[PDB]
Design a protein around this ligand. Structure first.
Ligand SMILES: CS(C)(O)Nc1ccc(-c2ccc(-c3nc4[nH]c(O[C@@H]5CO[C@H]6[C@@H]5OC[C@H]6O)nc4cc3Cl)cc2)cc1
Ligand SMILES: Nc1ncnc2c1ncn2[C@@H]1O[C@H](COP(=O)(O)O)[C@@H](O)[C@H]1O
Ligand SMILES: Nc1ncnc2c1ncn2[C@@H]1O[C@H](COP(=O)(O)O)[C@@H](O)[C@H]1O
Lengths: 451, 181, 300
């Protein structure tokens, strides 16, 4: 035979090598249908101890169904390797497109950017940050539609957790990423999108230098040149996305509200737009249907993609989405407005005889090792047990004598300013008691016994 | 049905694969830029094989070996049920990493510069005003990063006040506790 | 198509009604009860679940009705301190309060239906129902009639409208039209508190000499005695006690007997108030139509 076959696909040439894995083109032995096959070595995953990372990456791609994210069709497992059969796009990298053309004409740049952002928002809503967004990782189909690829550097956004992994291209990396600081995730993907927008419009990078230390300094500085051919509208958008201070940086909500972004925006791209629910699957609603009935996710999707309109599963699915729309359009009933006729239950302020401010954890001016020695002596006095994660990070435990359950919390020491420190308290995860009450009581007893 | 990869990275001009599965015939392998490969359908169990590189029998170092009564040294492979479904394979693989973790516990023994505080943790949900028109129990949507973290008011009277934002399915509750001390 | 709202109530979980993001104030029962009422004002909340540290469980709720009860029972004169308001812990006030009868914690699961929530509010004659997660044991939210009726109004377009929705208040007989607890313009605050304690009503229409509504003294308005720290003088008229909101008071929300149920529901949901005063041509009180009367009728 001679050819190399996996599934019904004959493997051809390498498309490229990503952050982790080798990508080859695959061609269907009967139809000639083309796929992109990502090969992952089992032994490499074991030796690098990244089994969980790969498991989640596969779980995420199996779940994702966005028109602007490369789709995972199947994964073929063998004794030595995993073969991820994915959607193939013939247009190649957005990178090469920007190089072929000079820069991209405003209308087509806007349209490609809207598609990239749509894909990035969908990731964030599913609690995933890409972390390696760049024109080389944005692929084009035969109709010039954008598709984000390579989730090799991606990570999960976990509750109460920060990311540190300094990863990706330096030209596309946010000031906090190149600085080795802790970051949330979404703001880091927003910065990269700012760089991609600048590249589409200008055909050049906003921060570039052959000498890496100068480049890093240019990024940290945030000074970049906005050409004259770029209108005042798009320039304000660029300036807001490429803010050095992550707290002042544009969010996807800020971008979606921007006049330049709203122009000619197709209605299927974001969840609150008219055509989104008709085209993009709601994974949570599919799960509700599987629960309410007793079916597979595929059984739900099949009645949607090729079923009858009156189908029991499709009816159930659309009723969840219709109800969700009612709720989503009564936004002031579910969330607080930013600072009309006052609400009838608005309380008058408490008269004295001053607005008190909430603060995070507890602060100390003492030396780090002296703060830690004080936490160790207060913990033993309270009969708390612990695990040292590192010098400034402990996992602490205590048994509730009434409910019998163990109570767990994480302690992190942080630097605030010059010799100003902060000790952070974070809950981990009671039926008989309350999990939140247990966390507050453990905290209160440690704060109280601390010097 | 049951694909098995035979890959040679050691280099050479021509590489052949022989084994129990083909009655020790020479199966010619195809090359990419470096790798010589073949994907065969093999049932579960033990399979003996050897590579033939440029007129010579060559040992594969990436796999275990077996020696026959007459001194024939062959590489050996195990084709398990768990190899043909990702999540079974990934579960087996993690177990090997956990087994390795053991070879390399709550206690009360203290340890033998701290990281810069993320600015996100300083965006205090209970310090920001919400606008008079809405229900006073309502709050804005929290950033996932500040969930589970503890906020407090300074001790005033003999009362300690603590709070934290916690997730319940897709909703968020900011609880405040008034506890005398 | 009468059971359309009962079927709706039965199909929806309490979870659906919970805000995406909200604030919940909890009090440990050993807390000084005056500190508890001030904490309600400072946090801008009406009710708080009660946590018993020794038992490791929620044992009840602290509401404005608790404040009405302490004031009425212990106030003696504007010349003397209300010692028990200054001295009692929640724990000790509750021993006194629930000395004669038995009353355990009334709560609901986030997975229980809205039908069960409405049933528990009426059956137990309460206004605040804590939603407690059985898995984590955490209180998530304090459910009310206001919240339930507003959630129901969002979906009234999603179903056929029953014929009773277009029927008048007179035909349907929803509400109270006899023995209406009311106060005069001159009625001392203490007297009004006595009326809340005896009649267990949530608001008193304030009437003139001719019997016409001029204002409304709701239980909510009593928390202003704690906010302004004017609780030690309950001799003051109900008018003087309401003066604080005269600059933003749009007037008394009322309805006529000839008006339809749908109109009344729409008026109540938009106004975000618990009841409307049923009046005649010349503003003379004829009855009360409360959210508890409405939900009882809709989910019957
Ligand atoms: C040129 S023509 C005429 O068109 N014919 C043609 C000839 C040969 C092939 C061909 C197909 C598959 C492989 C292959 N390569 C693997 N590399 C690997 O592991 C490595 C170690 O880790 C790295 C790296 O990979 C994952 C990373 O993580 N496992 C592998 C498995 C296989 Cl099957 C090699 C060549 C295709 C087509
Ligand atoms: N001021 C009042 N006088 C007499 N009955 C009332 C008054 N306010 C409410 N009611 C009735 O008392 C019951 C409980 O109402 P509420 O306390 O408003 O939830 C309902 O049946 C109301 O119609
Ligand atoms: N029918 C009404 N007309 C005008 N104000 C009202 C009415 N019902 C309640 N309020 C006011 O609305 C606030 C909340 O009261 P409640 O409806 O009892 O929760 C209080 O300040 C009441 O005085």
């Amino acid at each position: 035979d001679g050819r190399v076959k996996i599934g019904h696909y004959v493997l051809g040439d390498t498309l490229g090598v990503g952050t982790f894995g080798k990508v080859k083109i695959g061609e269907h032995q009967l139809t000639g249908h083309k796929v992109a096959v990502k090969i992952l070595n089992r032994q490499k995953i074991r030796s690098l101890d990244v089994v969980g990372k790969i498991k989640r990456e596969i779980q995420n791609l199996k779940l994702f169904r966005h028109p602007h994210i490369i789709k995972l069709y199947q994964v073929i497992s063998t004794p030595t390797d995993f073969f991820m059969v994915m959607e193939y796009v013939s247009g190649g990298e957005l990178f090469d497109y920007i190089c072929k053309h000079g820069r991209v004409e405003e209308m087509e740049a806007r349209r490609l950017f809207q598609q990239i952002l749509s894909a990035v928002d969908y990731c964030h809503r599913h609690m995933v940050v890409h972390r390696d967004l760049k024109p080389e990782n944005v692929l084009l189909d035969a109709h010039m539609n954008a598709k984000i690829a390579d989730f090799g550097l991606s990570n999960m956004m976990s509750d109460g957790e920060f990311l540190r992994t300094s990863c990706g291209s330096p030209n596309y990396a946010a000031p906090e990423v190149i600085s080795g600081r802790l970051y949330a995730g979404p703001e880091v993907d927003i910065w990269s999108c700012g760089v991609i927008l600048y590249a589409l419009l200008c055909g050049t990078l906003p921060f570039d230098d052959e000498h890496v230390p100068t480049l890093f300094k240019k990024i940290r500085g945030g000074v970049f040149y906005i050409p004259e051919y770029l209108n005042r509208s798009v320039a304000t958008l660029l300036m807001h996305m490429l803010q050095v201070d992550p707290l002042k940086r544009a969010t996807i909500k800020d971008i979606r509200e921007h006049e330049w972004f709203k122009q000619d925006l197709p209605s299927y791209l974001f969840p609150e737009d008219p055509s989104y629910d008709a085209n993009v699957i709601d994974d949570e609603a599919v799960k509700e249907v599987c629960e309410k009935f007793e079916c597979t996710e595929s059984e739900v999707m099949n009645s949607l993609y090729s079923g009858d309109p009156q189908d029991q599963l499709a009816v159930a699915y659309h009723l969840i989405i219709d109800n969700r729309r009612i709720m989503n359009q009564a936004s002031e009933f579910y969330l607080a407005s930013s600072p009309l006729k006052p609400h009838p239950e608005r309380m008058p302020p408490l008269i004295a005889d001053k607005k008190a401010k909430w603060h995070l954890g507890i602060r100390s001016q003492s030396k780090p090792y002296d703060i830690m020695a004080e936490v160790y002596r207060a913990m033993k006095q309270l009969d708390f047990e612990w695990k040292v994660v590192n010098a400034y990070h402990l996992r602490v435990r205590r048994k509730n004598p009434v409910t019998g359950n163990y109570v767990k919390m994480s302690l992190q020491l942080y630097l605030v300013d010059n010799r100003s420190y902060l000790l952070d308290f974070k809950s981990i995860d009671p039926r008989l008691g309350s999990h939140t009450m247990d966390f507050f009581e453990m905290c209160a007893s440690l704060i109280t016994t601390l010097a | 049905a049951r694909p098995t990869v035979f890959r040679w990275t050691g280099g050479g001009k021509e590489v052949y694969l022989s084994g129990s599965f083909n009655n020790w015939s020479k199966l010619p392998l195809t090359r990419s830029h470096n790798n010589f490969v073949a994907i065969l359908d093999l049932p579960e169990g033990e399979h003996q094989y050897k590579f033939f590189v440029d007129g010579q029998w060559t040992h594969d170092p990436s796999e275990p070996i077996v020696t026959s009564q007459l001194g024939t040294v062959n590489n050996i492979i195990q084709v398990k049920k768990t190899d043909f479904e990702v999540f079974d394979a990934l579960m087996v693989d993690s177990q090997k990493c956990s087994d390795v973790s053991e070879l390399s516990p709550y206690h009360q023994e203290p340890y033998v510069a701290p990281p810069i505080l993320p600015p996100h943790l300083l965006q205090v949900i209970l310090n920001k005003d919400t606008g008079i028109s809405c229900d006073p129990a309502l709050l804005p949507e929290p950033n996932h990063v500040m969930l589970n973290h503890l906020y407090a008011l300074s001790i005033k009277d003999g009362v300690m006040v603590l709070s934290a934002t916690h997730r319940y399915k897709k909703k968020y509750v900011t609880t405040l506790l008034y506890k005398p001390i | 198509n009468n059971s359309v709202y009962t079927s709706f109530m039965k199909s929806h979980r309490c979870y659906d009604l919970i805000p995406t993001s909200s604030k919940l104030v909890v009090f440990d029962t050993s807390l000084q009860v005056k500190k508890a009422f001030f904490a309600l004002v400072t946090n801008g909340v009406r009710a708080a679940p009660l946590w018993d540290s020794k038992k490791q469980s929620f044992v009840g709720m602290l509401t404005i009705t608790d404040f009405i009860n302490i004031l009425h029972r212990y106030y003696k004169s504007a010349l003397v301190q209300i010692y028990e308001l200054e001295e009692h812990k929640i724990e000790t006030w509750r021993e006194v309060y629930l000395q004669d009868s038995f009353k355990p914690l009334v709560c609901i699961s986030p997975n229980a239906s809205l039908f069960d929530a409405v049933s528990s509010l009426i059956r137990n004659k309460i206004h605040r129902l804590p939603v407690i997660d059985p898995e984590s044991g955490n209180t998530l939210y304090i459910l009310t009639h206001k919240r339930i009726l507003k959630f129901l109004k969002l979906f009234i377009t999603e179903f056929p409208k029953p014929e009773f929705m277009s029927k008048s208040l007179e035909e349907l007989q929803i509400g109270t039209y006899a023995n209406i607890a009311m106060v005069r313009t001159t009625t001392p605050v203490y007297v009004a508190l006595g009326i809340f304690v005896q009649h267990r009503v949530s608001a008193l229409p304030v009437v003139d000499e001719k019997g016409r509504v001029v204002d409304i003294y709701s239980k909510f308005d009593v928390i202003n005695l704690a906010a302004e720290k004017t609780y030690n003088n309950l001799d003051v008229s109900v008018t003087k006690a309401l003066q604080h909101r005269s600059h933003y008071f749009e007037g008394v929300l009322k309805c006529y007997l000839h008006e339809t149920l749908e109109t009344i529901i729409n008026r109540l949901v938009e106004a975000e108030v618990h009841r409307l005063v049923v009046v005649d041509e010349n503003d003379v009180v004829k009855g009360i139509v409360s959210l508890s009367d409405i939900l009882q009728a809709l989910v019957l």
